[PDB]
Every structure is written in C-alpha cells, then in structure tokens.
Design a binder for these strands. Sequence first.
DNA 1: CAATACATGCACAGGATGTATATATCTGACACGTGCCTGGAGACTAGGGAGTAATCCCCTTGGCGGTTAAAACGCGGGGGACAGCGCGTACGTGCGTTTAAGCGGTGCTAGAGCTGTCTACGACCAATTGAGCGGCCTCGGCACCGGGATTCTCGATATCGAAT
DNA 2: ATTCGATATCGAGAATCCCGGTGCCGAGGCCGCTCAATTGGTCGTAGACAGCTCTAGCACCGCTTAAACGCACGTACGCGCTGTCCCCCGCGTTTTAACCGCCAAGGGGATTACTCCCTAGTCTCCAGGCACGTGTCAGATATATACATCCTGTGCATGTATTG
Lengths: 111, 106, 109, 102, 98, 82, 80, 95, 96
Amino acid sequence: EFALGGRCLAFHGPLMYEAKILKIWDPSSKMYTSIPKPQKLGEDESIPEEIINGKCFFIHYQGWKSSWDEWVGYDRIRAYNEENIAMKKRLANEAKEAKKSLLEQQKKKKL
Amino acid sequence: KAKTRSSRAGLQFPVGRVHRLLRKGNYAERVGAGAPVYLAAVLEYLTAEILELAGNAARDNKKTRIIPRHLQLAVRNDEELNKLLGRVTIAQGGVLPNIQSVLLPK
Amino acid sequence: RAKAKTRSSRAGLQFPVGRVHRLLRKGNYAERVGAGAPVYLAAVLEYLTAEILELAGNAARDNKKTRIIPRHLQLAVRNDEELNKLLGRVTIAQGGVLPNIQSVLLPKK
Amino acid sequence: GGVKKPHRYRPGTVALREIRRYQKSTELLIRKLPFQRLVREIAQDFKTDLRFQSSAVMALQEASEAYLVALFEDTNLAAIHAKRVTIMPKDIQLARRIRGER
Amino acid sequence: KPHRYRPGTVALREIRRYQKSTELLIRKLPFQRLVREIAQDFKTDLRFQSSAVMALQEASEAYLVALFEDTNLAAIHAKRVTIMPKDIQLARRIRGER
Amino acid sequence: VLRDNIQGITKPAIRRLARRGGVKRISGLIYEETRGVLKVFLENVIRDAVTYTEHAKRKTVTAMDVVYALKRQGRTLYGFGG
Amino acid sequence: RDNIQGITKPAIRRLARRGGVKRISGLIYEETRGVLKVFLENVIRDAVTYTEHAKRKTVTAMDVVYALKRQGRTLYGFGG
Amino acid sequence: KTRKESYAIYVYKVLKQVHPDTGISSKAMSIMNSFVNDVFERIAGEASRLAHYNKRSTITSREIQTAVRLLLPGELAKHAVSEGTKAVTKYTSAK
Amino acid sequence: RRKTRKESYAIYVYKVLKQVHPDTGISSKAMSIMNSFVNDVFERIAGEASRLAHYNKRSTITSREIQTAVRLLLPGELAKHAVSEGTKAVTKYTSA
DNA sequence: CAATACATGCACAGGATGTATATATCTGACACGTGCCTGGAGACTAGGGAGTAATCCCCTTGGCGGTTAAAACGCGGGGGACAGCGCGTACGTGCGTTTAAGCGGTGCTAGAGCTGTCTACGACCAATTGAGCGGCCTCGGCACCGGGATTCTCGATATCGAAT
DNA sequence: ATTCGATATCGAGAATCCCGGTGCCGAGGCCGCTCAATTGGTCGTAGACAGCTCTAGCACCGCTTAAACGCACGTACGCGCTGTCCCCCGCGTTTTAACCGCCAAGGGGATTACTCCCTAGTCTCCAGGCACGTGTCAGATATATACATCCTGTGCATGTATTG
C-alpha cells in the first residue's frame, strides 16, 4: 500500500520514477498528514484540482531535488511492489529503445 | 616639566622605548642619540604607508574598520611591499583574486 | 704563576678556544659569555671541518690528487645531501657543478 | 516525447565559481581536529606527552595553509607550462626542486 | 665526405667538458666593461679592485648555472629538450624575483 | 598512543586548499603524496618547535615557539607576536 | 652601452653547457642578458652602498661578498 | 613582569593622524606590532652589521640612513631618508 | 711598516687536516674557502645561540643553548656526533 | 549554373541557482575612563671612540705592441616544436548517507608564571709569555706539451622480422 | 618467396687519457717579533632552585548539520601519433679584441697622532602606557528578493552540397 515515507513508483511523462511519500492528502477532510499530525493546506501550498478530489500524496523524486516535489493521485502513484518494479524496468527498456532509435536516426542523418 | 623626545622629533612613535630596545635588545654596546630618532621616523613612515593603503582597501571594500584582508590587499597590491614582504605571510589574509588567462572560458 | 696551558689543549681541541671566545666577546653578541660555550663552539667547528676535510680528501683520492682544490671541496659538499642543505644556497669559487645528465638527454636505440 | 534533463553545469563552471568563492574567503579550510591529531602524532617520536596551546595548533593550521596555497599558485603555473589545466605530482616535485628543499 | 657528428653528440661532449672544468666562462674584459658601465649610473668615477670583478664573475656564473639547471628541469618538464625564454621566466617567477 | 591519523587530511580539504590556489582540475594521486608533503613540512617545523620548547625547560609547545621556528626556516608568520 | 652585448652568444652557450642544456633557443640570449644585468644592478647597488658607507669610493671584493651575504647567496674564498 | 610592551597606542595615533575616522582589529593590530618589530629587527641588525663592518662601534644617524636606503626598496627609501633627515634636523634645531 | 694581524684559522685547519690525513696537502685558495666556511658557520651558530638565549629572556650564553642550536642547524648526522663529542669535550675540560 | 533546404554557427528567451543586496538584531570586541608604577627624561661627569691632518705606498688605471683563441657570419640539414586528431578515462558534478567536526558546558589539573635566595660564576684588570703571524727561500706537485691507445661516433653493407 | 626496414659490425676519424719530460712558482717550514691568551684575584649579579598561584589545556560528553564518502554518468583533456617547417648545431673562414707584459703615474686605503663631542652611567622625578572595567555600535547571522549568468533549445544569417 501507501505509507508516509515509504517507497513508491510514479508516472512522470511516459516513464516510472521512484519517490518518497512525504504527505498523505484526504479529499474529504481537506487535510493532509506530514512527516518531520493532521493539518490543512498552507497559504503557499496548493494541489492541482485534477487530482485533489482523489487521494493525493506529496512525493519527492529520488536522485532529484525538492523543486521536483509534487502532489500525485492514484492515477500517477502506485505502490512499490514487484509488479510496478517490473513494469518500471519495461518502461526503462522502452526509453532505451527510444534512445536507440534516436541514435539510429542521427547516424542516418550523418550519412 | 619634562617633554618627551618624540615631541622634540615631531613623531608619534616613541624614541624612549626604541632606544631601550636598542640597548637591552643587544645589538650594540653603544648607541647614539639620533639613531632611535631616525629609527622611529622610518618606522612611522612605513607604518603610515601600510596603514594608508589598508585604509584605501577598507574604503574600496566599504568597511570602516581595518581587517587583515585589507592588510593583505594593501601588501599584495603594492609591488614594492611584494618583495619587501613577499617573504612574509600574514594572518587571515587570503590571496589576491587572480585567475590565469588560459583557465578562462573561451 | 703556573705554566700557561692553552684552553684547546685543556679541552683536547685544536681550534683556539681563547680566540673564539674573543670573537664571541668582540663580535658583540652579548655582554656575558659562559666558559664552556667557546669550548663547545670550537668542538662543533672541529667536527664540521673534520667531515668536510675527510670528504675533500676522498675527492682528492679518487681524482688521483694529493692537494685539495676548490673543485674537490665542491664535489665533497655536493655529494653529501646534509652538507647540501647546509651549503645549498652557498656558492664555491672555482667549484664547478656536479656532473649529471637527465635521462632523455641520453641518446636512444 | 520531451524527456527532462537536469541543471548540471559544464565541468569548470562550478570550479571557477568556487574559485571566486574561496579567493575571497579568509577562514581555515582544514578541520581543526584532524590537523590537531596530525600535530600531536608527529610530535610523538620527538618527545612524548607534549602539550600544545590552542593558539599554537591553529598557528600551525594557518601557516600550513599559507605554505600550501603559495605552493599551489606556482603548481598552477607549472601545469600551464606544459599547456595543461590538470596539475600532476610532477608539478609540485618540480616546485619543491626549484625552491631548493627537494 | 668529411666526418661530421650528429647534432648533439658534440654538444654532450662539451657538456662533459664544461662540467668537469672549473675555469671561468665569460671573457674577463667584456665582463669588466659591463660592470663598469652598470656601476657608472650609480656613481661616476668609481674604481674597482681586480678581486672585486673576479667576485662578480664567480657570483654571476654561479647564479646563471643554477638558473640554467632550473631551466633544464623546467624544459624537460614539457616533453622537450630545447629551452625557450618562457621556460626561464617561469623559472624566475617561481623562485620569487619577478 | 594515537595512530593512523595521517589520512586525517581529508580528500576534499586537499581539494579546497588547491582551489584557493586557483587550479582547476586535480590529479588522483595528488592527495596521498601531498599528505606526505605536509608530513615532511610539519615534521621539520615541529622539530624546530620542540627544540625551542625543551630548551625553555618546557613541557608545553607555545605558539611563540611556533612563530619563532617559522622565523628560523624561511616560512615566517605574522599576527602571533614578534 | 655596447658592453651589455659583450656577454656574447657563445659565452651564454658555455653557461648553458655547464648548466646541462642541450639545445638553446635564439631568443634566450638577449633576455638572458637582461636577467644578468638586473641581477648586476641589484648586487652592485648593495655593494656600492656598503662602499660609500665606509667613506670609500673604490669598491672591494670584500664588499662584493658582503652584498651577496645580504642578497642571500654566499660566496667563499673571496674573504670574510 | 606583568607589564607587556607593544606599539598599540602609537600606531593608533599615527592611524588617527592618517585617518581620524577608522577603527582597527586587535589581531590586525598584532599584525602591525609584529610587523614593526620585524622591520625594526632587520634595520637594526643590518645597521649594527655595517657599523661593525667598517670597524666602527657606535650607532648614529649616518649608517641607519645608509641601511634605510639599502633595505627598503627605492621608492620608500628616498622618502624615508627625506623624512628622517628633516626629523633629525628638527631634533638638533630643538636640541 | 709591519702590517696588522689578519684573523684566520689556517694553522688549525692545517693541523686537523694532518690529524685526519697525515700526508695530504692543501692549496691556499681552498684554505681561504675553509676560512670563509668556518667564519660563516660560526656566525650562523653564534647568531642562533645569541638569539635563542635572548628569545627565552636569558642574558647568558652557555653550553646548553648552543648544543640546542647546533642541533637546530646541523642535521642529524651532523648532530648526534657533534653534540656527543661536544659534551665529552666539555666534561674533559671541566675535569681538568 | 541558381535555389533552397540542410547543416553549421550566433542571438536570444527562459528557467534554475547561487550569489550580491536590503533589513532587523544582537553582541561582543573596540574604545574610552582610571590608577599607577616603572621607565623615560633632566643634569653632570669620564673618557674614549671618532673626526681630522699627514704620508706612503701599493695597488689600481691607462696605454701600447703581439698573438691567438674565440666571436661572427654563413650554409646546410636534420631533429624537435608545434598543430591536429582521436580515444579513453578520470575526475567534475551532483544526490544521498554517514560521521565526525563544531559549539556549549563542565571540571581538573599540570604546567606556565611571579617572587625570594644565594651561590656559582663571569667581568675586569696587572703580568707575561708562547703561540701566531709577517717575511724568506727552496722544491716538488703540478702546469704545459707531445705521442700512442682507447673509446666514442657515424656511416656504409649483411641478416632476421614483418607484410603481402 | 620477395622486398624492405631495423640492427649489427667494421673501419676510419677524432677527441681525450695516460704516459714521460721540463720548467715553475705557490707552499711549507724556519726565523723573529709582539700582543692577546693565560694566571690569579676580586666583586657584583644572574640564574637555579624552592615555592606558591591560577589559567588555559586536556579530557569528556551531548547534540547537531556541514561535510566526507561514495557512486554513477559524462566529456574534455592527456597523450600517443603523424606531418611539416624552421631553427639551431656543426663546421669553416675571417676578424678582433683578450690576454700577457711592461711601464708610468698617481689616488686613495691604511696607518699614526691628536683633541674633543658624545655618550654610558647615576640619581631623582614624574607622567604615559598598560592592566582593568564598561557601554556600545560594526559587523556577524539570518531571511527574503534581484540579478548575473549558465545552459540549452530554437530560431535565424550564412556556407554549401546537391539537384533541376
């Protein structure tokens, strides 16, 4: 499932990325729980309305800075389990094939 | 009423202690009267130049109190002190802000 | 009055202790100089001269010579690294340099 | 389609930036405690159980930095001498050679 | 065809010649005229003892042979055998007189 | 008896000392032999300092003796007494 | 005057050959003469200053090695 | 003794003579004190030398004029000789 | 006239040469080199001795600060041998 | 042969990002007031180092003739210097993790620092003498010279490895 | 099997090493002088030693967060190689002044003598500099914006390569 501070795999464009769940949002209470305790959204804090009706998680991408931290719903978030890790490997292979097609088209462009 | 030798010489550096440092500081068994006067005079001259260059550095760094960074800029920007005191390293000075030209980006 | 005996022979030395004591006093290093200080000073001068002279003698011997030339002195002082920091910033007249060649300056095959 | 790409600078921009940062700095660049451990371990075979003033060890600290940084500009000059920007162990060997302590 | 050594063999031979030797490698009267003309600006009508110009001779040759050893090291540094001036401006700069 | 602190001159500190000097790129084997360079410089400095120390019948190394020894060897320091 | 060129090119070559240099650039000679001469006014300026200290206006080899003693380089066998 | 002797107020007053608005740091002030002590040692040691070096044995103004033109680089020198000569001229005029 | 005495260590250098080499000769220029040597190293060690006596606020040159200084200048090889024969020379001097 | 799209090289928008700039605030080292005590200044004496006249001599300066080793100029050519290129790897840069340096608090003590004593010890001065230094005079190690050997160099012909 | 390049050796040339020969002038020993080392005694005083104080240096500990370490990707230098040019070594001839040496002259370095100006030394006085205490503003620290500026894409000015 989803836990505060636990691993998760998330969409970002077409690809899968690992993230930490720092906050858990409940749409009914207009509230989220955080890690160093329920609290509402702050003055500068907001969630996009496309997901704010579903259960959101504020997540931090591993290997990337806090400017990439964002709220994601169940559409964009999945639990860290072997099925999600395997399809993460699959989409990494898709990105590898896209990079290989990039190499092929640039080497045909050179010719 | 006893007047000091510095006011006789028109200096702020003291002739008395530098005569005493000539005497007990074991440089010569006999020292004349004018030698500490001349000695204090040249010490005043060099101190005035290093302090005036430090004051220029403090104005350029827009600080109203002398810091040894200002002293380092004073001693290193002046090339004459740079072989007077290039032998000398001072406390909390840092280095000159110099970059060699080949290290610059093209 | 007893027979005059030199301080160097009293201390078993050859450099003159009375003379170097006079150089200490008249050289204006202090108003007071201890008694054994010129003795020890003469002794360490003897030691330095002993090593530099025996090295000059070896420099004369492998050069098939019997008189000490300043070239022998320069070779003696440059062959020893400890004397080389002692005399490194010092220059010897008619001394020359050590015969040395760096590696790539040699011809190759 | 458009995949992200980070804000990594070219190798050298971060370099020169911290060069300008550090050539304005005046503090000590070695941590006090390890270099104090150096001073205390070196002063063992000379004599045991020494004590050192807290001003003494930091005088050693800043003096050693002055010697090393002064070695480092002419190390930079020796590296530029071979038309290089990388310094090498040969550069400081030559520096200590031409100063006359090698 | 007359016998001719390759460039450098004679050079190393008289490396050996001027290294085992100790005599003084500048012609004495040109150096004396140098010393007179360069002491002329400090003081007019100045007289020099013969041992004095001998001392300047020995000190100058010692200074230049040390500087030229340093030159050969800074030249062999940059994968080279031939020296250039830029070698010796760096050699003087690192020794701290520029 | 303290032992194996020679690695205490850490790798980024040697880098930082270099970057004050104005260099750009550092070779990999610089660090350990520059630690040896610090070792030889610190040992002769500390030898002169402990010699000055034990002449004064002292068991404490003074900063005074430090700047004293630096005045001796040609690497003198300012700001700690003359 | 002309005597700065009196330090001739084969003489500088001889100094290089005692210095262990195999090949010498053509631009070595004139700026090497400059390095030589600047060393000369430094040393002989110290030596002459010693000379008119002594109420003297001829110079001695003793004053020369004395000026070297100041500049840092020590010469032996010329007195002192 | 407990009394420790340094050029604190003197360099402070010549600073006020130059800049009567500028402060000074204490460790910068120790920089100044050690610096004037060191240059004093150099000038006095060479003056004692070149006094010994012509078989003289007294310390007067002429040899220290010689040594201040000798040690200090030229630019500082001629001005130091000028100010020292006018200072000793003032001293002998005021007796 | 009869000229004044010039200070030199020539006869002592000759006789210590005979002690280390009973058959080896000496040239005059090398001997002047040696005199400049002994004067220079004596001035170095005596200046270090006078300073290091002054530096700890002492007004008396003794054997202790000069054994300290000889060890300051002369390196190890030139050290323990020098200090050892110096102390035995001092003890045999005070014994007599 | 012209065009035009393509490729390659500046111009610029724009987002990160780290650093300079503005403002509050506090805080602790700078500076200023005080007491004092010790070191600088006033006055007088001794005497001795030093400035000045003399002199002489010796050691430096100037010039003039010969000779020759060295400097200068020049031709050639072959070896480096220097430019370019490619490939690998080695740190450069950046993000996450450990950890250990850094600040504050605490104590304790060993060793630096100041005071009194007094006794060993160096400073100073008369005698004197023996070592040490100025002069002289032979001689043999050594400088210079010449001929044979040795070692090094360099370039013209056999012989093995490599490519085809 | 054939050709070619690197090395391998022989021989000529040539620079230096080593062996006699011959003359030479610094060097080591003798002699004479002379003055600083030595003996001896005293007298002040400086450092060794004992003892007391108190200060910062050592040691520990507990929380921090800046940094150390490590690792992963990347790309730009390090260097190995090659081509080409030009610059300096090598050798020869011509010149030229360096060197020896010889003599004339005189300029000032060195020494002696004198006489005196200044300075070490001593006593007394007094005030200036330093240890100490405080209050207080220059600058450190933190926080929020502004802006250079770095990197990169993308978009247009221009070479150019292919095509109609």
